[PDB]
């Protein structure tokens, strides 16, 4: 297996302690995917900690790969500071038949801060600086020239810069693409996955919107929003609280008969499959606007006021449009209230 350097996943077979062109010094694993492996290390000559992507030898993962450098050049090339947002490729290789794509070090993504939290979730003070430089993140992608849709928006993939300040950063274009000929994918984490994706219907950079929605309550809450064991319970999940989609989407949904029924006069409900009724399971009270917060667990601290809740409320509901053409732009959640501090 490439004269032993590889094992039969075709991943790089890691040595902890290995030197690469008398430069890298490979401390650790940190991470593993469908992709490959990401290892930290020690560039000797820039003296400074790196994460490493260890592309597997595998020609459809390399191919991807370069569709990721692509991507990471193009943003990382921009002459705007919104670009801060997204990780720095510092530079790719061809090393042992694997590609490398070499980044700055990053700390703990969202995901390690809902557990170091328990599961109870952070300020609606942290969320909201979370959610100012997500938008803006997102507002960057949508740039004409760039037209990045993400695909994979999840606590996993947005990385504090460092563990003392709220500055975050996206990783993993590994699944990103640009806005194209619109075609329908399997795409996004399930939890994350916005209903013109659950509906089989073309997608576009609204998708990455939805999953921030979804994002944002998650990490004041502390639990995923909608958390489906499959499609038709995501989907579910979803009407609890959205209630059941417009007839306009419904009727141009390829796969609207997975969930829903078309009755006579021509309006839809739920398939039989147990469940809340639909819209039953409000924001409003996942939230808890009038009653302290999650769980009631922000009764009397600063900035969690009923007038707060309602205004990051009336951005989620925004967020969460069925509907991909009236779903919230990156400009105008930056102009939400929610933000008027």
Same mark, same amino acid.
């Given at each position: 297996y490439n004269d032993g350097y590889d094992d039969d996943n075709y991943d790089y077979i890691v040595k902890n302690g290995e030197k690469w062109m008398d430069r890298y010094e490979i401390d650790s694993l940190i991470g593993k995917g469908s992709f490959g492996q990401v290892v930290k290390a020690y560039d000797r000559v820039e003296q400074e900690w790196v994460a490493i992507k260890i592309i597997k030898n595998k020609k459809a993962f390399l191919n991807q790969a370069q569709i990721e450098v692509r991507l990471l050049? $193009?943003? /990382? *090339?921009?002459?705007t500071e919104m670009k801060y947002y997204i990780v720095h490729l510092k530079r790719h290789f061809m090393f042992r038949n694997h $590609?490398? $794509?070499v980044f700055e070090m990053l700390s703990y993504n969202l995901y390690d801060l809902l557990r170091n939290t328990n599961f109870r979730?952070? &300020?609606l003070n942290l969320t909201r600086k979370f959610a100012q430089q997500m938008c803006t993140a997102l507002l960057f992608l949508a740039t004409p020239e760039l037209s990045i849709i993400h695909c994979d928006l999840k606590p996993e993939n947005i990385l504090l810069c460092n563990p003392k300040r709220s500055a975050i950063k996206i990783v993993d274009f590994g699944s990103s693409c640009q806005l194209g000929q619109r075609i329908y994918q399997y795409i996004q984490s399930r939890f994350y996955r916005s209903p013109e994706v659950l509906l089989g219907m073309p997608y576009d950079l609204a998708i990455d919107m939805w999953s921030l929605g979804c994002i944002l309550v998650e990490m004041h809450t502390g639990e995923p929003l909608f958390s489906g064991a499959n499609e038709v319970d995501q989907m /579910? *999940?979803?009407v609890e609280v959205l209630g059941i #989609? #417009?007839?306009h989407i419904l009727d141009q949904a390829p796969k609207?008969? *997975?969930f829903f029924e078309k009755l006579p006069d021509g309006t839809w409900n739920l398939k039989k499959t147990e469940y809340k009724p639909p819209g039953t399971r409000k924001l409003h009270n996942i939230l808890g606007v009038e009653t302290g917060g999650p769980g009631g667990r922000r009764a009397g601290e600063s900035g969690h006021t009923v007038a707060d809740y309602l205004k990051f409320k009336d951005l989620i509901l925004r967020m969460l449009d069925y509907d991909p053409k009236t779903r919230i732009q990156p400009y105008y959640a930056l102009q939400? &209230?929610?933000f008027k501090k």
């Open positions: 050049e $193009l943003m /990382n *090339k921009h002459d $590609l490398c $794509l979730g952070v &300020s /579910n *999940k979803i #989609p #417009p007839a609207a008969r *997975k939400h &209230s929610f």
